[PDB]
Each structure stands twice: as structure tokens, then as C-alpha cells.
């Protein structure tokens, strides 16, 4: 016999799947009881989460609002239309000059669709090299010639790099490379670059070589919405983004593109108009994706409303201030930060002067409930044991931490790195030897206890701590 | 210019933070439980799945594999993903020594593109079921006019195989002849609108004769496969891809299953040869194509896979098939043309061309009656806007507890709707603008809508509590 | 010290390089003392040869006449212009409707340039499958999936086949495949197809799937010039060819292409014109080739004047009549010819009913001074030991042989295949065992002697038999 | 009736085709009555020409000696074997360490086959940029991004350039580009580079990036054979060449490749052997070409015997001395030569400091029977009106000219450029205006007459002037 609808279909998770329920409750506790510093993470709102976990998941809605491949989309269409209009509003865009596709499943799908829209297979792209701070999907292949991202397989990549001494983008080498390589598309924006971008110069280079210019603002999108960093929309043809990083929304992607009359250009006819909209929509669907994830789109619409608020503007300001305060504390202890500071939400910490690799710092921190990620820095070839760790402010800022709290985070990090060195000095640099120091280390247990005491006190968005299964 | 307290932006319910989106979700909830939802790729998932989907799991970056991540903090995410993978193998009755599974694909189209990228180089040759014959977009779809539609016909070289134009069954002889001439690297089986089971044994014989890999995309029928109610592709295929939101009744996600261990003996193949899909498939998903896994989808999928392994789910799958057959017999008794003259799965494909109708007209009129279908290509179609068919599926309404007699009532509603569509076309014209005039103040549409809603209200509804919904 | 110009630069080959001179003299004797049946071979004229071996070899002339990348082309331009105009005249083409590029180094370069002009990498082509009679450059990959020609690597090939029982092109399967595969270019013409081509049906198929239509007439180009087979120009967008086969010229290629207004077609705009010329020229140079080989172009101009003569039409008629007479004799002995005859210059002889492969027949024939080539027939997978031999009439017809002489050739071939069977019957099918039967074989010696006696009855173009070193 | 064999087949060209015969005789006179300075031209020997115009043209001989697809090759095989063996001898190569394919129809076919042998479509190559002196087939696309050579279409090119101060290859910039772009193949050798090549440094760069190293020695092959320039064979994996430039043979190409045991390398198994031979042969045939041109192969065998002689070594020395003397004379008049001199057979003359383009100098020289070619120099973007002219010594040296005669050539060139300036000064820089000065110009007539008077006296290889139709 079939189970009654109520039994399988309405019973709460806690009863249907106690194993998964318990693991989610353990993860909720973990998010509360640690210092969460992954620069691409955030804590999104309960309101976003209620839309994300909703009956919107049940609907097939391929196509565009008002031109679907399925019936039943009267309300899904209104949700998607509201999501798109709120996206334009959040970034201060005129709807006659910009459009947006909100269907990409995540950031990497958004980028691959934007590229597919404007490029044929094997067309040439240039993005920021991964060890210089660019993303996998900006054309990443290794210095050993190994193609990693599919954006280096289906397209031809030549990454541009930062200056090897200052850590800032080398705009002169960018121009020289672009004039030699003749890319169809230049990508700006990054995953681990701690400075703002001269989009005007990128536009000058793109015009000189006849390339399209795309900005991937995934990491700093929340700061862009708050008008706290340079706006890529002033100079770029296409702007892609994720929505779950500094924008504090669900996991999703968006592709913004110019519409309407083109600016004057010698060699271009008069009354010319942009022609990105149809190509970008087609690339997302039917070229690459299938059904939109409407629960993500609904959740994203919520997040875009929240991003347009004065409270969100203050949040973005505080993110930047917290990142600067943390960077200043770390440099005050003698640590090496790439570019010697930050203009955004992250710092990239070069551990090579200490004789450490980022995997060791990440692992020790993780045992202490300090959540970071090892990260490539300039010149790295090892993804297993890169030379850096990357620290971001969005998630802890969302819990209400201010500059003095981020100075405490700096001291926790300083204690963690000091302990990592002590373990390496005692047990060795080989990872199998280093790991011996991670067992029954009283200093690790004591640092973990201190971190938990610090972390547990702060508020947590997304659920009620008073209702959670694990309060200790 | 202060930040909002965490409680205000971060803990307040959706109903207060975003009344507009809340109201639209409430309207969509009513729409889902007050009409007859017949899109064959839709289902109504459980509340337990939805609670995992809307959870703190959305906040985590966890690129890599369990135990080998690019970020710290994955102690519990790793346990959730491991449980998802093990439950996936268990749901399909697979030995872990012989099969593995990647549960990170964001959806079905991402799963297929990653599976192809794993085993194919750009421009390698594929053969899948042609879209008008019932195959999916991602099976290499380009049109009979030569227009490349799916990226699977751009980045790879496609030659679709077709059904027999008179019987509607796959033409296995032309499949073999085509494969021996075209020499594909990969043959794809499984479909989106094919109403019969698949001779996987014959597909394996063809693949062996031409040296191809064999992949089954069981997206639509995966729930039936898990319940052992249709042929298992795992007996004969190298790789099996699927979505999880169709007959499997889970969240929107994809999975890629692949063989592991020793290869079966083959002449010319060396002794002790082993499969080598695992590393390539994992690498294709990440870092080649995707970024961070969507852990809330993975957790929700783990729940759905536990639910799929139950005796109640097997009974559900049996009932889905029985309902589809009863609907088909009812429609054929009236004279309606079903491809292959019936069904062996969860759907029927209905050719409207003998009536002089296109599927967009039927879909539009049905929608006004709260009967949710999709227009669908049938053999020989070239129009996606106005195809010659409509596709009807049993999973969603079967999940509301409907049995055969209820599906006969659905058949009568569809007969009434198609009759009304034909009557409107006879009175108002075949041109869409003229036809549309017949949809205003149509008393028979209103009567049918009222009858549909009264019938729909007789049944329970999974995923949310009807007693608590805003629009009662 | 440098050698004086007269020593290194003006002294004849016979003194500068006796080894190469002696080998050329032996090759000259071989060509006029055997029976030369390779269907793609001919004996070109002394006049063609004099232009081929000339100071034209010294010139760099990249570009087009009147638009060169080098100085000094006052006369090279006149030679190339005359070659092009004579090419159009030889094929009865109006210069308003057809142009031609005469720079391709050979046939395979001509085809690759024609494809490059109209296709992007990986665009789809369909040509006649090699075992069905098509050329390597028509998209050849094997039934085992191994890409052989670069035309299956840089482009995406789906070959069409002959009917497995009749040997004629299966036009219904061609159309069905083209509608499914949607090629950008369909190629017709072949290397071992013994029948004429329904270019009209090819045009109907090409129009149904929106493809360009190209004919590679390399083998039969001489017959086309003589209006002795169907003209591909009536229906094809592009016609490629070699010049050294039935056309009886130097080794070179040409690409003909339509110019001017396009014929009426639904959907295409009014006043639309062909746009092949610039693309085809650019593909030849600077895309693929470097300097034209002006000695080949000059020699080609000579051959094209000779091909337009009344004597050449008579030659082309005789080539066809000789091929038919040869095929009739062979079938009268019970041999299996693909399609049961011929409409062109060649026959394709299926040896499989005899239990032989073409490599054995080719090898025994070679020992008798009967020059053939083993050849794929339908279903073959082995290039080493294919199931057929291909026999052509152009070369021996150029020595003046007529039907009764080709009947004697048929008898020599019958003797050779009989001896091949006798050796296999005694020594077996394994090649190493078969080869043992070729040592001190008195019947081989007798057949060779009869072949040389017969071959010496006829004149020889291209050089004077009376002046050759080895008489 | 057919024409008798003697009539069509044995009658001399002078009777069969008086039009073509007369044009060849006019061309023979032109070659005698001018100063022929195209650096890629030569005057080959009568002995070469007799093999080139021979019955060898009649033979189909696809395959390799002893492994043909046609009967009848008993003597063609001996000719090809002798050509190959003499090719190895002429370049002082051990047959156990090097092989050679002598079937390429010309230089561009040789290069495309060599690339096809070792590369897949879209693999990466780096060659000398055309304006820096590289050949079309070294990956030429323009600074405007226009793909010109098929070697920039079927493969992915990134050219390396000369240093703008010195005019020599900038080896550090080559290394930097190679490490960023990661080519599969690096090409050295050139068409208009007036200096020798540091093959040792090319090998160091290739090893640092894991690339194959190919030298295209087409222009200087005669100097290489005479051991008068650096040997590429010491360091390159593959060496391609034409045979009609300084080698003084027929128009043809050759591909040399390493064979036998590989040199010691960490990260490579012991007893490793080279594996180029079969791939190179396959690329030439059956991949790209059809029947070999046996008359070219026979003529090439003759030329290779002649190239191995002591007289040819003296010729190669004289070519270099003549180019130096010419360059010294031009620089003494104040002209600008790229790199300030030459180490090979050519000089590249930058006309830009004069306010001239190379098309004007070429046209005026051509009217005076001075045969040159306009040529790109560093920074050029115009193929129509490039900034230089290229001048070579091989052809006139083959007529017996020595250093003092090349000083006279320098004065004729000086008069030509002086006249070009005077015409431009009077009539203007616009080509239509400049062309007005080329009509009824007494100074052009006097220069032409002086050139003819000078040129007519010298000997001419390849035919007997005493027998030519036009002696005035
Ligand atoms: N500048 C930057 N930092 C970043 C990212 C990025 O895209 N750009 N990431 C964006 O997510 C994460 C790192 N993601 C990476 C994924 C794969 C490889 C990589 O090279 N993998 C090789 C080597 C593996 C190994 O040695 O163990 C491979 O997978 O084979 C590197 C980084 C986090 N930090
Ligand atoms: N350094 C160098 N010099 C050389 C050659 C070479 O390959 N490299 N050549 C080797 O043979 C000749 C020049 N060949 C060339 C062929 C085409 C174009 C080119 O860019 N053509 C464009 C633009 C034509 C136009 O503006 O009129 C085109 O064809 O569209 C340039 C040079 C002679 N000198
Ligand atoms: C600049 C940038 N763009 C796109 C993405 C991709 O988003 P998805 O992971 O949702 O595909 C990232 C992810 N970067 C993750 C990190 O820096 O840790 C990114 O940093
Ligand atoms: C066989 C098959 N495979 C893959 C997919 C793709 O799943 P996503 O939409 O999640 O990308 C579908 C979707 N088919 C939807 C339908 O038939 O209506 C499908 O039918
Ligand atoms: C270095 C080089 N390589 C190959 C070639 C091609 O040879 P073919 O033209 O036979 O294809 C050339 C021609 N260079 C001619 C010139 O410099 O004027 C060349 O200079
Ligand atoms: C139809 C056809 N096309 C092109 C070619 C190529 O010509 P080249 O060999 O010059 O590249 C051939 C050669 N066919 C040779 C044979 O059938 O024996 C051919 O048969």
C-alpha cells in the first residue's frame, strides 16, 4: 500500500530522517560556535531560507516570463519578473540600459553561459590568473600547462597577472598581452584580489584590442550594490555575479548585460543597439541549463530586496572596515598581506615568509573552530599546499561583529599561526610528521575553547538559536 | 546609518520581510493543490525534503570531495554528502565495489554536461534520441533545419537516432546502422517524452559493435528504476545520469553514477583491466565545470533517497505506472492518438495533429482551467512554439494519492479541455490572435475550471499544510 | 673557389648526376616496355614536359596576376592568366559564370583549399566512402573509426556509400543521411567508381539540406573536357580536379567556382551573387600554400590547349571504348567487375570470388611488367590486402592502343590472375608462402616476355624511344 | 581520329604551344636582363631542370619506398631512397639519429604536415612574428587579429617578436611568453630575419615549457648544408626546409626528424626512443598529400648531390660575403638595415626613416629590372604598403657575382631609392599621385638601361644563353 500523503509528505524532517536532521543541527551549531572566515561564505537570512525551502521547488518553468515551455507559470512568472527588476534596482541600473538573467544555477554556470553567449568554441579569453587572484572560471590552467577549468578547454585562455612585487594588477602587461593575444573577451573581477579594479583602464584595453569586457563581481557584489566599491557597470558590457557571497543571498548566479543604444565608436554605424539579451538568454536556456530553480529565484528576490536597504549599506561599510581592521592587526604582528592591505571584504595572507603552507594553517585553524581556506598566492603551483590563507569579513560581520571584534579575530589567528609554527618546529615540515602535533595538543584544545566562548555569544541569522537542538 | 540588528533582517520570517514574495509563494501553493498538475517532469516533494532544502546547509563552501576539500569547516557537510552517496547506491541496488556516484551536479543538464566532459574531448561524437522522437535537449539536440540548440550539439558532434515513424518505437536497426557509419564515442539512451521502456541489452550490443561508451539518462523514470518497476540501465550502461526531482520525488539536483572495479571480459581488452570513470567524472564536475556544491540540495537529496528506498515508495511507483496506463486507455477509447498506442512508464505523449490542433493551444486553454500540461514535440515537428503534441504525466497527481479511477476522471477533464479547444478554433479561427478571442468569458472554460478545482480539493497535498495556507 | 656557372649550372644531367640519370633512363624504359594500367596515371606530352622543366621554376609569384607580393612577374602573370582562361575554355565555361584558381600544387591540396575556403574547422562534409570508390580527401576514416585523411580530422565527415548489391551510389541513403547529418558541403566524384554521376540528384539533395555541392572530377576531367561524361558544372557550386590523370597534363590541381548571380531559390534575397572567388583564392594563398609552382602552371596551360583539340576528344572517346572492351573481355572470362561494367576510364575488379586479394595480383603483375594497383572494394577493411584491383585505360590509350589491343591486355590480365591462382593453390594463402612461388617461375618469365613484346609495338609520348639509353 | 603519338606527344613545345613557348623565352630573357634580388629566389641548374622536366612526372607512388599503394615503383623507389640518403648526407646527419621525408610538395605543405604529425587541432604553437621576420606558416595572424595563415586557424598561435632596440629575437620575452602560453611546439627559423639563431637557447626555452622544437631553415638551408651558419640539428626535434631558396634546388619541401635513443632527461624512462618517423610520414601521406611528385624528388636528389660539393660550400661563403658587402654599401649611404647588418644571405632594409613604403620602391625597381620584394619590418600592419624592402644575395651570386659586383648592385639600389624619393617629392605620397612619376620618366629609362647593360654580361645557369630566343 502507498503511505498516506501525511506520513511521507507532511511529516517533519526530524521524524522522517533523524540522521540528516541531526547532521543539520550539528552544522547549525558549528556555524554558531566558530569564527567563520571563508571570504566567499556568508550567513543568509531566515526570510531567504523560507523562500529557498518552499513549494517553488516543484515547478518546471523553462523559457522566460510570458514565454514558457510549460503551463502553470502565472505566479512563477511574477516571481522571476520581480527578481529581475529588484536585481536592476539593487545595482542602480536603468532598465532601458541593462537587463538581467536570474536563472543561472550558481556562479560557474553563470560565467560559462555568459561566455557561451558571446563566444564560439576555442575563442580567446583573458582573465586574472588564479595565483594572482582570479577564479577557476576565468580560464584557469596551471603554470605546468594542465587545463583545469573547462573555461580553458572549450575556450582558449591567456591569463593576466599581478605585478610580482606589488601584488597589484599589472595594467601595462595586461595591455601588452591583450594586443599580442587578441582576445575576444577580457574578464575582470576576482576571488582573492584584495584591491579595487580600474574598470576604466580595462575598458581602454578592451577597446584597443576590440574585445568585449566582462566583470565577474561575485565576491564584492554586496559592496557594489551598496556603492562601496567601484561600479563595473560604468564600463563593462556584461557583469556576472553569484548571490551567496557578500550579497548575502541564496546560492545562485546572475548575468547582467547592456541593452539599448551603443555609445559612439569610430567604425560602428549610427543608431546601433546592443545585441546581448537574446544571446545571453539563449545560452542559459535552452543551450546549457534546463528548468530554472524557482525556489532559488524566489529566495534571490528576497535577498535583492534586503540588499537595497539602508541597513545593508551599513553592513557593506562595516564589512570593509572590519577587513581593514583585521589586516592592520595582522600586519602589526609582522605578517605579510598581499598588497599590504585591502580595499574590499578580504585579506590574502602570504605565509611563505613564515615557512608555512596554507593547508597546515587551515587544518590547525579548523581544529580550533576557526574556518578559513588555504589559498594560492603569486607564484604558487601547489593547490594541495599553497603559500597563503584567505580571510574574509562578510560572515562574521553578518553576526554583528565590529572592528574591535575583528581585532580579536586577528589575535585568534595570530595564536593559531603561532601554534602552527610551534607544531612544525617540534614535529617537522613533512605533513605526516606535522600531523603528529595535532593529536592531544593542549594548546589546540585551549584555543578551541577560547574560540567557542568568543563565537557562541554573537547573534546568528537564519534560524533561532533558542530552538536549536545543540545549545552547548 | 546603523546596521540592522540580526533579529530584524536575519531572523524575521519571510511573511514580514517580503510580503510580496510571501504572497506569491502562497498563491503558488494554492495553484499546486487546487488544479490537476500533469507535467510529466514535475512532482510534489515532501515537507522533509523541503526542510533540508531551506536550511543552514546553504551557507557552506565545500569544494572537493568528502575528506579532501578546498575549505575548512566540513566535518558535518562531509557526513551529509557521504550519506547522500551511500543512500544513492542503495536506492538503485548497486554494489559499492562496482558503482560510484557523484551527487554534486546542480541539476540534470549540469549532470549530463559533466558526464560528457569527463569522457569526451571537444567535438567528440555522440548519439542520443532525437528530441521530436522523445530525447532530451542535452542528448545532442539540433533541429531538422540544422540549427544547433543544445550546447551538447555545439561542444560535441551529435547525430541523433530516431523512432520508427509509423510505430513510434525506437528503430534499433537504424540506430545500429547509424552508429556503425558515424562511429560515436558515446551513445546516450533514456528520454524525456518516450512512453516505452528501453532495450538496454540491445544498446549495449550496438555500443560494443562500434566501440562506444553507453550512458543512460534515467531522469524521468529514476523513481521507477529505484522501485524496480522498469528495466534497470545499470545492468548494461557504463554511466547513468539522472535528475532527482521528477519521478524520484526529491529536490532539484542531478547525480552521475559510474562503473568501478574490473571490466567484464572483452576480446582485445587486456586482462585485469579496470574501469577509470571515477576520477574523470569527479574532476569534470569539479573543478572543471561547477564551483561550490549546493549542500542544502545534497542534504535534501539524502532525505529523498531514504524515502525512495521505502516500501511505500515502491507502491507509489507501481501506482504511477498503473495510473498512466489507465489514463492512456481512457484517452484512446475516445479516439485520441497516443504515441506507440499506450505507455510502459509514467507518461503518455498525445499527438494532436489528427485534430488539426497544436499543443500550445491545448496548453493555454488547459491552464485557464487549472489543468497544467506542457505542449510537446512529436515526430516530425519543427515548431517548438506550436508543436503537434501535448505530454501528460502521472507522478505529481499520484503523489496526492490519486488512483486509476481518479486518472480516468483526469482523462475526462482532458477530453473536455481538448474538445473545448477544438470548438474555439472552429468558431474563432486557427490564427492564435483569433483563437485567443474565444478564451474571454467562456462559460464552458469556467465550468471546467470549477469542476477541476472541486475534484482537486478532494485530495491531500505533500510538502506543506493546506490547513495553514494563506489562500484557502 | 666557386665552380664556373657552366660547370655546375649548364652541364647536362647525364654528366652532373649519372646515378639519377641512369634511374630516369631505366624508368623511361619501364614506362614504354610494360602495360601501364594504373587508372590515375597517364603519359603526358613532351611539350608539357618542356614547360615543366624550365626557368619558370625560379620565380616567386605569390598573389594573383596583377596583385603580387614580389616584383618581376610581367611574364609569369601572362602565363597564369593564359592558364586560367584556357582552363575555362577547356571545360566550356563562361567567364562571367565561372572562375578558376590554377595554383594548387596537386589534387589533395586543391581539395583541402576548397574546403578551407567554404568551411570552418569541424564543419560537416559528406563524400563517397573510400571502399565505395571515393578519395582519401573526401573525408576518409575507416569502418574501425580510425581517422585517416586530414579531411576527417579538421572537418567532420559522414561518408555515403554505394548499394552493397548493385555497386551504384545509394541515392536514397545519401538523402536520408544528409537530412539527418546536415552537412555544410556534399562532395561527389570519385577514385574508383566505374559509373557516371547523377549530379542533378546530388543538387536536389544538397538543396534539401542547405549544403554546398562540390564535384572532384580528378579522374574523369579529360572525359569531362571532351564532353564524354556528365558535366558537373551544370549542378555543382565548386569543381576541383587534378590535371595529371585523364586530362593528360602535369601534376597539379585546379579549383573552379561559380561567379555572378545565383539562380532563383526560395528564401534567398533578390540580386544575390556567388561569393566564392575571394574565399577560394585566399584559402590557396595566403592561407595554405606559398609560392605557386610556375613551371607546373605553364605546363598546365600547354596541357589545357592540348585538351581542347579535336584529337583530344577522339582520345577521350577511345579511352571509354577501351575500358568497355577490356571489361567485356574480363567478364567473358567469368571475372566480377563492380557494377558489371563501366561508363568511364576504369574498371574495378572484385577478386574476392576467386579467393584472392589485390596485393597478390598487383605483385605478380608487377613481375610481368603489368602495372596495376590493388584497390579497396565494398566492405574491405584491409588496405594492405584489399579485395580488388583497379584497371584504367588512359595511359595505354595515350600510346595509341585501341579495343583489340585492350582485349589482348585483358588476356594478359587473365593469364596473370590464372598464374596467381596457380601459385596460391600450390603454396597457400600466407604471403610469405605465396612469395616463394614467385622465384624461378617459368610462366611468369613467359608472360613478362609476351608483355614486353606487345608493349614495344606502340609509340610513346613524352620522350623519344629512339634516343633513350636502354633499348 | 586520334592524333598520332608523335604529333601531340613528341612534338616540341615551340611547335605545340608557341604562345607559352614565347612567354617562357621572354621570362628567360627577363631573368638574364635584370638584377634579381628576391631573397627566396635562386637560379637552379640545368641538371636539376632536366630531372624536373622528365617522365618521372607520370608515376603514382603513394607510400614509402618498398611499401607502396601501386605497382611499378622499382626505379621510383631507388630515386626516393637516394634523395633521402643524400638529404641526410648534405646536412651531415647520422642516419641512425635522423630521418627525412622528401615528399612535401613545397615549404608550406612541409610545415603543415610537420605540425599535423605532432599536434592535434587547436594545439598551441609559437613562431617568429611575421613583421619580426617569421613566415606565414609560423602562425601568422595580424596585429588587428585577422587570421591569415591556416596555421593560425587550425592551430592556436602566439608569435614571439624581436626586440625593438636591436632587431634581434628577444629571448627573455620569448621565454616569458612560452611559460605563460605553454605551447606544444616552438618554431624557429624565418623568412626575413638577417641574423643567426641561438638554437641552444631555444632548446632551453622548449625544455622549460615542455615544448617540441622545430626549425624551419628554408631560407638558409644552403648555408646550413655548407656549415656556414649554426646547425639547427644540434638542438631541434624536427627541421623543415624548402629546397629552392639558398639550397638551389627544385621547388619542394623536406621534413627531417630525430630517430633512435633520446638524450638523457629526468622525468623520462630509460631506453626511450624518438617516435616522430611514423607520425611524420603519416601526416604527409595519407593524411594530407596524395601522390608524390617524383620529378621534384628526382630533381631534388640532383640538387642535394650538388649541394654536397666543395664548389657549393664556396658558393655559400660567397653568398654571405656578397650580402655583407651589399649591406655595408647601403649603410655607407646612410640607409637603415634591420639589426644593422646581416649574418646570412639577406638584408632587410627599413625605408621608414626615408618616408617611403616598400611597395613604391618595389614598383620603381621593377620598372628598372631590379627585382625585389616589399617586406614587413617591425611594427608594420600594412601588407600593401609595408615599411621595408628585402634584398637577397643567392640568385645573383649564382650568376658569378662577387663583392665588387654587389657594391654596384648597392649603387643601383641607391639610384632607385633616390629616384623614388624624387618622384614622391614632386608628385606626392598618395599612390595614385606617385604613379604619375613612373610614366615617361627619363631617369627610370636610363636606370633600366644601365641595369640591363650590367646584368646581361653575367653567365646564367639553367639554360644556354646561346640558344635562347631573345638575345636582345
Ligand atoms: N584566486 C583564487 N582563490 C580560490 C579559488 C579561485 O578560483 N581563485 N577557488 C574557487 O573555488 C578556491 C580554490 N579552488 C581551486 C580548485 C582547484 C585547484 C587546482 O589547481 N586543482 C588541481 C590540483 C589538485 C592537487 O594538486 O591536489 C586539480 O584539481 O587537479 C586550485 C584551486 C578557493 N580559493
Ligand atoms: N617576414 C616575412 N616576409 C615575407 C613573407 C613571410 O611569410 N614572412 N612572405 C612569404 O611568402 C612574403 C610576404 N607574404 C605575405 C602574404 C600575405 C600577407 C598579408 O598580411 N595579407 C593580408 C593583407 C592583404 C592586403 O592588405 O592587401 C591578406 O591577404 O588579406 C603579408 C605577407 C614575402 N616576405
Ligand atoms: C569571482 C568568482 N566567480 C564565480 C565563482 C563561482 O561561484 P560558484 O562556486 O557558485 O560556482 C566564484 C566562487 N569562488 C568561491 C571562493 O572564492 O571561495 C568566484 O570567486
Ligand atoms: C531525460 C532528461 N534529462 C535531463 C533533464 C534535465 O534536467 P534539468 O531540467 O534539471 O536540467 C531532463 C529535463 N526534462 C524536463 C522535461 O522533460 O520537462 C530530462 O527530461
Ligand atoms: C621560412 C620559410 N618557410 C617556408 C616557406 C614556404 O615555402 P613555399 O613558398 O614553397 O610554400 C617560406 C617561403 N618564403 C618565401 C619568401 O620568403 O619570399 C619561408 O620563407
Ligand atoms: C578523385 C581524386 N581526387 C583527388 C586526388 C588527389 O590527387 P593527388 O594525388 O595529386 O593529391 C585523387 C588521387 N587519386 C589517385 C588514385 O586514384 O590512384 C583522386 O582520385
mmCIF file of C-alpha atoms in Angstrom, chain A residues 243-334:
data_model
loop_
_atom_site.group_PDB
_atom_site.id
_atom_site.type_symbol
_atom_site.label_atom_id
_atom_site.label_comp_id
_atom_site.label_asym_id
_atom_site.label_seq_id
_atom_site.Cartn_x
_atom_site.Cartn_y
_atom_site.Cartn_z
ATOM 1 C CA UNK A 243 24.380 35.910 -4.944
ATOM 2 C CA UNK A 244 25.580 33.989 -1.864
ATOM 3 C CA UNK A 245 28.819 35.805 -1.032
ATOM 4 C CA UNK A 246 28.866 39.442 0.100
ATOM 5 C CA UNK A 247 25.383 39.894 -1.420
ATOM 6 C CA UNK A 248 24.113 37.614 1.402
ATOM 7 C CA UNK A 249 21.530 35.713 -0.633
ATOM 8 C CA UNK A 250 20.919 32.146 -1.773
ATOM 9 C CA UNK A 251 23.403 30.237 -3.897
ATOM 10 C CA UNK A 252 22.662 31.380 -7.454
ATOM 11 C CA UNK A 253 24.109 33.370 -10.323
ATOM 12 C CA UNK A 254 23.023 36.338 -12.401
ATOM 13 C CA UNK A 255 24.135 37.735 -15.751
ATOM 14 C CA UNK A 256 23.677 41.469 -16.362
ATOM 15 C CA UNK A 257 24.088 42.775 -19.909
ATOM 16 C CA UNK A 258 23.805 46.085 -21.710
ATOM 17 C CA UNK A 259 20.684 46.912 -23.713
ATOM 18 C CA UNK A 260 19.693 49.813 -25.924
ATOM 19 C CA UNK A 261 21.788 52.257 -27.933
ATOM 20 C CA UNK A 262 25.542 51.761 -28.007
ATOM 21 C CA UNK A 263 27.927 54.618 -27.145
ATOM 22 C CA UNK A 264 29.668 56.362 -30.059
ATOM 23 C CA UNK A 265 32.517 54.371 -31.592
ATOM 24 C CA UNK A 266 34.510 55.084 -34.742
ATOM 25 C CA UNK A 267 33.993 52.215 -37.168
ATOM 26 C CA UNK A 268 30.487 51.493 -35.803
ATOM 27 C CA UNK A 269 27.306 52.588 -37.616
ATOM 28 C CA UNK A 270 24.911 55.138 -36.193
ATOM 29 C CA UNK A 271 21.790 54.139 -34.238
ATOM 30 C CA UNK A 272 23.464 50.835 -33.313
ATOM 31 C CA UNK A 273 21.959 48.929 -30.388
ATOM 32 C CA UNK A 274 23.313 46.267 -28.078
ATOM 33 C CA UNK A 275 22.500 42.676 -29.007
ATOM 34 C CA UNK A 276 23.370 40.723 -25.864
ATOM 35 C CA UNK A 277 19.924 39.989 -24.440
ATOM 36 C CA UNK A 278 18.776 37.226 -26.787
ATOM 37 C CA UNK A 279 22.212 35.557 -26.909
ATOM 38 C CA UNK A 280 22.570 35.529 -23.133
ATOM 39 C CA UNK A 281 19.072 34.165 -22.526
ATOM 40 C CA UNK A 282 19.617 31.500 -25.192
ATOM 41 C CA UNK A 283 22.947 30.465 -23.657
ATOM 42 C CA UNK A 284 21.315 29.929 -20.260
ATOM 43 C CA UNK A 285 18.335 28.169 -21.829
ATOM 44 C CA UNK A 286 17.992 26.116 -23.974
ATOM 45 C CA UNK A 287 21.755 25.929 -24.632
ATOM 46 C CA UNK A 288 23.128 24.996 -21.200
ATOM 47 C CA UNK A 289 20.528 24.704 -18.423
ATOM 48 C CA UNK A 290 17.143 23.051 -18.109
ATOM 49 C CA UNK A 291 14.470 24.032 -15.622
ATOM 50 C CA UNK A 292 15.107 27.154 -13.548
ATOM 51 C CA UNK A 293 15.355 26.536 -9.813
ATOM 52 C CA UNK A 294 12.430 28.703 -8.821
ATOM 53 C CA UNK A 295 12.996 28.350 -5.092
ATOM 54 C CA UNK A 296 16.433 29.922 -5.651
ATOM 55 C CA UNK A 297 14.897 32.670 -7.772
ATOM 56 C CA UNK A 298 12.281 33.416 -5.118
ATOM 57 C CA UNK A 299 14.936 33.374 -2.395
ATOM 58 C CA UNK A 300 17.109 35.643 -4.546
ATOM 59 C CA UNK A 301 14.275 38.148 -4.962
ATOM 60 C CA UNK A 302 14.081 38.334 -1.158
ATOM 61 C CA UNK A 303 17.830 38.840 -0.872
ATOM 62 C CA UNK A 304 17.774 41.588 -3.511
ATOM 63 C CA UNK A 305 15.075 43.457 -1.594
ATOM 64 C CA UNK A 306 17.194 43.115 1.537
ATOM 65 C CA UNK A 307 20.318 44.277 -0.322
ATOM 66 C CA UNK A 308 18.631 47.540 -1.351
ATOM 67 C CA UNK A 309 18.077 48.677 2.258
ATOM 68 C CA UNK A 310 19.955 51.287 4.319
ATOM 69 C CA UNK A 311 20.801 48.537 6.784
ATOM 70 C CA UNK A 312 22.530 46.613 4.012
ATOM 71 C CA UNK A 313 24.515 49.695 3.008
ATOM 72 C CA UNK A 314 25.728 49.981 6.605
ATOM 73 C CA UNK A 315 26.591 46.274 6.554
ATOM 74 C CA UNK A 316 28.747 46.683 3.445
ATOM 75 C CA UNK A 317 30.562 49.640 5.027
ATOM 76 C CA UNK A 318 31.155 47.560 8.159
ATOM 77 C CA UNK A 319 32.449 44.617 6.108
ATOM 78 C CA UNK A 320 35.101 46.874 4.581
ATOM 79 C CA UNK A 321 36.003 48.453 7.919
ATOM 80 C CA UNK A 322 36.295 45.056 9.617
ATOM 81 C CA UNK A 323 38.543 43.738 6.846
ATOM 82 C CA UNK A 324 40.823 46.782 7.156
ATOM 83 C CA UNK A 325 40.963 46.478 10.951
ATOM 84 C CA UNK A 326 41.821 42.780 10.711
ATOM 85 C CA UNK A 327 44.506 43.425 8.106
ATOM 86 C CA UNK A 328 46.033 46.178 10.229
ATOM 87 C CA UNK A 329 46.146 43.889 13.268
ATOM 88 C CA UNK A 330 47.821 41.095 11.305
ATOM 89 C CA UNK A 331 50.408 43.392 9.742
ATOM 90 C CA UNK A 332 51.045 44.844 13.203
ATOM 91 C CA UNK A 333 52.171 41.354 14.237
ATOM 92 C CA UNK A 334 54.602 41.240 11.295
#
